[PDB]
Amino acid sequence: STPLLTVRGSEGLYMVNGPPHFTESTVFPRESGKNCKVCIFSKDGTLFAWGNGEKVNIISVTNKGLLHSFDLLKAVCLEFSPKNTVLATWQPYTTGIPNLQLYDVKTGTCLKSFIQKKMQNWCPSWSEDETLCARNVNNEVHFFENNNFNTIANKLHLQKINDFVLSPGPQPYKVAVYVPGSKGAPSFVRLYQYPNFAGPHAALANKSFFKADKVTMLWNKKATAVLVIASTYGEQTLHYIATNGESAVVQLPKNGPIYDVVWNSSSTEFCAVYGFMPAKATIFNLKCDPVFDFGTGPRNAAYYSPHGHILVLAGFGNLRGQMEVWDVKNYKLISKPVASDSTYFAWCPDGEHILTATCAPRLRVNNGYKIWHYTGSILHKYDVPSNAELWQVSWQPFLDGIFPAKTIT
């Protein structure tokens, strides 16, 4: 029942059984994976799509078998809709055929195509239940209901909207929208509940801030709050915006960059990694008060386990790859494993194992991956031969609530 790994590189695409076996998986024939430029699992990990730039294949991971071959589909990017109804595909716009193509997974027919010139945020945003699908079109948000893409159900027009995120979980869905503002005016993030956009008291919340080059909005799993990172790795501010209408600048008690901000899956805590090296890391509660301080370290990244019971404070990029593994139930350091030269980190959905990889193009030497236990043991590793590259390693995803949050003993 352990999550699979997909390994995509010059030696081709293959799958590996998860811990503790790490045997090559018969779910995926290596033969089918040459020159693989893109691959993705569905959110529930039951479907898998891959393309070589000439074609796209869809297989069932669970009910092993090819579902579709799209023999002329030159997809560069792929994403399934959250309940597996749709495979969204993107290729560069040329001339021009609509380049964003949504395929019905059951029938392999084309549900809808759109012009999507920018690769950034190319994919439509489904609600977790797929009852809602939104696109940022001409700086407005267009909403589609029930995968009916022939009629726009609702439009959100608010000056120019540059980005939006839908709240996760069940209905009613909320949306956070980022409005940069007119020249010389402050930016803001506003929260709405779909479809209540009209009237002077429609907005759940508003937080204004001085224009930034880059804004990231992060919902909590309970859809009660958004963290907003307003950024130019230097010069960021962190804003908290709650669906109850409370908003605040988060007070980070050390000058310098904000490297990372992540929610606990509990939705009542978040972690910020901040300040000129050595970076501070702090857990905050919904009052944006410090809950626990990790002091300082060689960190620029934070990763909660899916269950939110373990926190890794890691230093990747230009740092030496130290991963401080914290028990964040007991607030105890478990381990400080070192994943030198890592370009990629991901928790296993089991909340026990960790994938680190070194991939081209971010790094051209020492390509390979390691599977860790969070206690710092190396359970599995693979190094590519000198004449080979690794491009991607990823876990088979699983929906929350399938793997238990195993006690740290």
Curated annotation (Swiss-Prot):
Keywords: Acetylation, Coiled coil, Initiation factor, Phosphoprotein, Protein biosynthesis, Repeat, Translation regulation, WD repeat. The keyword Magnesium does not apply. Widely expressed. Expressed at higher level in pancreas, heart, brain and placenta. GO terms for cellular component: blood microparticle; cytoplasm; cytosolic small ribosomal subunit; eukaryotic translation initiation factor 2 complex; extracellular space. The modification Phosphothreonine is found at residue 2. It comes from the Eukaryota. One of its GO terms (biological process) is regulation of translation. WD repeats lie at residues 53-95, 96-150, 151-201, 202-246, 247-288, 289-330, 331-373. GO terms for molecular function: cadherin binding; mRNA binding; ribosome binding; translation initiation factor activity; tRNA binding. Functions in the early steps of protein synthesis of a small number of specific mRNAs. Acts by directing the binding of methionyl-tRNAi to 40S ribosomal subunits. In contrast to the eIF-2 complex, it binds methionyl-tRNAi to 40S subunits in a codon-dependent manner, whereas the eIF-2 complex binds methionyl-tRNAi to 40S subunits in a GTP-dependent manner. Belongs to the WD repeat EIF2A family. This is Eukaryotic translation initiation factor 2A. It comes from Homo sapiens.
